[PDB]
Write a protein that binds this DNA or RNA. Structure first.
Ligand SMILES: [Mg+2]
Ligand SMILES: [Mg+2]
Ligand SMILES: [Mg+2]
Ligand SMILES: [Mg+2]
Ligand SMILES: [Mg+2]
Ligand SMILES: [Mg+2]
Ligand SMILES: [Mg+2]
Ligand SMILES: [Mg+2]
Ligand SMILES: [Mg+2]
Ligand SMILES: [Mg+2]
Ligand SMILES: [Mg+2]
Ligand SMILES: [Mg+2]
Ligand SMILES: [Mg+2]
Ligand SMILES: [Mg+2]
Ligand SMILES: [Mg+2]
Ligand SMILES: [Mg+2]
Ligand SMILES: [Mg+2]
Ligand SMILES: [Mg+2]
Ligand SMILES: [Mg+2]
Ligand SMILES: [Mg+2]
Ligand SMILES: [Mg+2]
Ligand SMILES: [Mg+2]
Ligand SMILES: [Mg+2]
Ligand SMILES: [Mg+2]
Ligand SMILES: [Mg+2]
Ligand SMILES: [Mg+2]
Ligand SMILES: [Mg+2]
Ligand SMILES: [Mg+2]
Ligand SMILES: [Mg+2]
Ligand SMILES: [Mg+2]
Ligand SMILES: [Mg+2]
Ligand SMILES: [Mg+2]
Ligand SMILES: [Mg+2]
Ligand SMILES: [Mg+2]
Ligand SMILES: [Mg+2]
Ligand SMILES: [Mg+2]
Ligand SMILES: [Mg+2]
Ligand SMILES: [Mg+2]
Ligand SMILES: [Mg+2]
Ligand SMILES: [Mg+2]
Ligand SMILES: [Mg+2]
Ligand SMILES: [Mg+2]
Lengths: 71, 59
RNA sequence: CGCGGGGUGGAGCAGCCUGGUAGCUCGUCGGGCUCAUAACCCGAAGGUCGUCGGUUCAAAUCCGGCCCCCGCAACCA
RNA sequence: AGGCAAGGAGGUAAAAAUGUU
RNA sequence: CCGAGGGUAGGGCCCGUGACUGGGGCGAAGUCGUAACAAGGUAGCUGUACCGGAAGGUGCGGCUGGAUACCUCCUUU
RNA sequence: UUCGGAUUGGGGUCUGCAACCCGACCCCAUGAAGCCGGAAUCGCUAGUAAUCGCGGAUCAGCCAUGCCGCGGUGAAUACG
RNA sequence: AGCUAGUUGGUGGGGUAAUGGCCCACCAAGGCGACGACGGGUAGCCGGUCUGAGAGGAUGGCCGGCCACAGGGGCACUGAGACACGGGCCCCACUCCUACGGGAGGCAGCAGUUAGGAAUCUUCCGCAAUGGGCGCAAGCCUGACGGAGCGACGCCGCUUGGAGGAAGAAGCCCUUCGGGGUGUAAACUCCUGAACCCGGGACGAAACCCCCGACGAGGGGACUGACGGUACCGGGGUAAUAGCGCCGGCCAACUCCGUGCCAGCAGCCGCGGUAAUACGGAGGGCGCGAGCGUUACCCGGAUUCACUGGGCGUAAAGGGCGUGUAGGCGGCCUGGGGCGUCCCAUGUGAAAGACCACGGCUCAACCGUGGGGGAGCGUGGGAUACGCUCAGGCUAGACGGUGGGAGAGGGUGGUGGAAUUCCCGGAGUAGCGGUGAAAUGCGCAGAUACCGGGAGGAACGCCGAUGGCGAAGGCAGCCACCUGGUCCACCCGUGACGCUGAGGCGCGAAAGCGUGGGGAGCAAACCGGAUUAGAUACCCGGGUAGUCCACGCCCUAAACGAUGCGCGCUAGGUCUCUGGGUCUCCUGGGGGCCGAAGCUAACGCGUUAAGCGCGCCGCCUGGGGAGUACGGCCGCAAGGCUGAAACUCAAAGGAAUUGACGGGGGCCCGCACAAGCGGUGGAGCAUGUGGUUUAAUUCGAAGCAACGCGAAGAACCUUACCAGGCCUUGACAUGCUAGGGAACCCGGGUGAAAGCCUGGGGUGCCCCGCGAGGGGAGCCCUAGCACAGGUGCUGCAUGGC
């Protein structure tokens, strides 16, 4: 089925954490745990604090996200 | 919770069947789709007894 | 403008006090060194040594005028 | 005196940090 | 009289919670540093002592699960 | 400086439709810097380095002092 | 880790059906305990059941036995028998009624309600059978029981058809577009006839009862079914439920789309970040089948707690060693006993189950009959090889004597020089010290260096070792004293005295702590300097504790041979120390090295085993958590010993190998440095580039291996860049629709050219026709098209080079 409820909202990176997990403050409002894309990791695209990435968000829990796009 | 997208919420009644999941830390327990407020996965058609999904009624 | 301690390569400072010696530190240009950025390490300039004339055998170095600069007197009124 | 050495000697510089693909 | 049990002090265990506090496992791109692994750039490890953000560091002693030869000069074959 | 040739002015000559940007070349004048070059650093062990000139290709012409090729003169020093 | 005060024994008495600390009075002072008492937890126990090759391991559902309890607790009474489930009294708790004084209850009986919970049944019929109780008996009870009901809850049995029937229908999927699969599956034809109806329809039930017979034995008779109008049999009679898991490896079975480290799957390995054999679907397949999976729990596999059957040098693991108690274990001979041990006989090991046979229910399940076995335990008889035990003996073990020896063994008492440092004397002058460099530092108050004397404290150079000693930690000046161990010769003496060793006692580097001394050097902490992005470090200079001793404590360790001790056996050689010999070579006792057999994961080990054995002890059972916690003991404290789990991870680990690397080593090379000649960097210019500028300064080349390079020829061309003007199937290719004109040149205007507009010479070919005229080829133009074109982007998509 792939539930396409996936919330494609932008956020500027507040903070860096390990394993490429990042508190990113959103255009939407909150700062929530959002970890990297696999794609980005593969491509070695270094997320650094102060960047407008696209944090994909689950409707089950927005408090965790997933970074999609390169800054 | 397995499946493809839970109907579950916050104060709904659920069933555990146990069993470790390797990736996830400290989780030793599968919620089992079918019974209670853990309703089944819509449009499973193959592996569905593991998932509380009753038959696709045929014509 | 009183007072009195100074302006040092370009920047911050030593040497001023026992007078002959300009030093360090930072930077700029070459070069090394690397995969490089180095750091580094080499060198290359660059000081009216705030100045003026005075001393001496010799002056940043010693007395002064200054241009000052920082000041602090310029307060009790 | 050489042959092969045995044994004690004091030198073999001191650094050295980083990694966008 | 014996006597279940009750009461009153005192402990014991055990459950519940419990302000307070210790607090460990893992984690690709956390932060500081680079300890260790090559003599890892001061051999390391070690037991203990004190100290330090921290890895640790030093001291005393032990160990080898440690690496190591190449020139010159004196005594002697 | 009769070393040394930059730069510039003037006149030309040739090739090409055309040399101003942007050619080569000739002539005459001009005659700058430079007195063997810091720390560095490259080349080379034999007809070699060094020096000296010629030819070629591309090409109308040539900015070629390049590249490729050829020959002439002809070293030094290698302990290690 | 100690427990016990009726607690252990006794006299008397009570009590009991009966013994007894069951209880009481009194005396005695035991009794138990590491061969695990007491305490805490867990738990009804067994026959069994499951598993398992077995030994075991788990478990104790139902059915059988025993036990214990009937809300919790306590007590008696009656009785053959209870400490009495549907009996009593009392208290407590709870529910119920109350005219508040009080009474009544007990489903852990069936059944059911409720609660808890993942989860568990009918408020069933019947006394017919069996049993039970009462009764002369009739009979009466009987939720014991017999049955039915519910649940795929389990096991077994069957049905969802069978036969035919395409080189192969469709539907659906794949495709290499040929084809293949689904699949003889279907449809269809033939036959059966689960279901369902009609007909009959029970065994189980012959006793107890009556009468003959004595109310006996024996004989005749009759009544008596919940199941159930079920089982079944006869006749008829319809093709009439298929599902679930999986499909990467283990592990049986593969493809397509969807998805693209997301959604997801997972039991582990792990799969997924664009054709996923692993995710979602589809088909296809495989496994089972009225089931199939999942989860829990248990065994197995797991020889992963190891008796059969693991180990301990490095992997987890040898205790730090000594002595030593319990315990375990014990040389040779000769006999007695006969406990262990073995055998036979027999008793017991209930039934059910397990096992084998046969029988019955249409099979099987299930049940029956028969049989055997069965570990263990008793009893009687024996056996004496071994173990035990008692006796006698023996010298191979062990211990001892005599003769010696090596020795840093340990303590006590002294003493010897070298050195340092400190003081004084001398003489001396300008620095010394220090480092990769320097600085702090000390020194003209005269240091550093040098002599002379003294003060003291510490350690002991050379011998010195791969050496010796010790049980180990450890131990070195020298002397003496006391004193431990040890080793050999002689085999003289004892006659198994032995080996180990839980505990226990004893020792125990170094640091550390206490009291007091001592204090030269060194030297944590500390202060300095430097070094450094920082320096709490290396380095240097001071410096307190401490190092040193005495007493006392601490007791750890890479307390290492990372190897417990003991004894026996099993090729050597070689050096080494130390003893005796008949002394170039034998024979003992140590220390090393290399190696037979063998062992081991390899490394290695290898008469000094890690080999073959045996004895005994100490540990180990994934890592991390963690030597931590909690408790306990010790300690003046520091901390030690003892020693977990929760959790968490599919590793942690060893050994070797290939590499790779090393601010590791050696050998070797090169114009790589040296040796030499000449340059370059400096001057100008010639050029290429980096930058900046520009409308654009074409794009690329990047340390060597980019830079007189691609550019081996940029005025235009080149030319890819920019301004302007213009063109469009287009400069070029192979076609189409076609429409006219069409081979072709000669011009004119505009314009920087390109181009645009435009005139006019100008059609022959193949041809058919007398001619008018018509078509097609070559060839060219216009409109749309197939298409061109792109030095346009990707050399981490590439080929070539
Ligand atoms: Mg979305
Ligand atoms: Mg180190
Ligand atoms: Mg009595
Ligand atoms: Mg209890
Ligand atoms: Mg229990
Ligand atoms: Mg029973
Ligand atoms: Mg009761
Ligand atoms: Mg009850
Ligand atoms: Mg009685
Ligand atoms: Mg009763
Ligand atoms: Mg419930
Ligand atoms: Mg009834
Ligand atoms: Mg009656
Ligand atoms: Mg009744
Ligand atoms: Mg029954
Ligand atoms: Mg699945
Ligand atoms: Mg799978
Ligand atoms: Mg699948
Ligand atoms: Mg064993
Ligand atoms: Mg093993
Ligand atoms: Mg180990
Ligand atoms: Mg003994
Ligand atoms: Mg014996
Ligand atoms: Mg039996
Ligand atoms: Mg003196
Ligand atoms: Mg020894
Ligand atoms: Mg004798
Ligand atoms: Mg004798
Ligand atoms: Mg004897
Ligand atoms: Mg002390
Ligand atoms: Mg004290
Ligand atoms: Mg000192
Ligand atoms: Mg310091
Ligand atoms: Mg020091
Ligand atoms: Mg030792
Ligand atoms: Mg021992
Ligand atoms: Mg061998
Ligand atoms: Mg060996
Ligand atoms: Mg072994
Ligand atoms: Mg410890
Ligand atoms: Mg403790
Ligand atoms: Mg290794």
């Amino acid at each position: 089925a792939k539930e396409k409820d996936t919330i494609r909202t932008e956020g500027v990176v507040t903070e860096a954490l390990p394993n490429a997990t990042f508190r990113v403050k959103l255009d939407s409002g909150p700062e929530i745990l959002a970890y990297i894309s696999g794609k980005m990791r593969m491509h070695y695209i270094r997320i650094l604090p102060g960047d407008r990435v696209v944090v994909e968000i689950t409707p089950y829990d927005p408090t965790r996200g997933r970074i999609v796009y390169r800054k | 919770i397995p499946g493809e997208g839970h109907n579950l919420q916050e104060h709904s009644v659920v069933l555990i069947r146990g069993g470790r999941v390797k990736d996830l830390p400290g989780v030793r327990y599968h919620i089992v789709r079918g019974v209670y407020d853990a309703a089944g996965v819509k449009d499973r058609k193959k592996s569905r007894s593991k998932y509380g999904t009753k038959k696709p009624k045929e014509a």
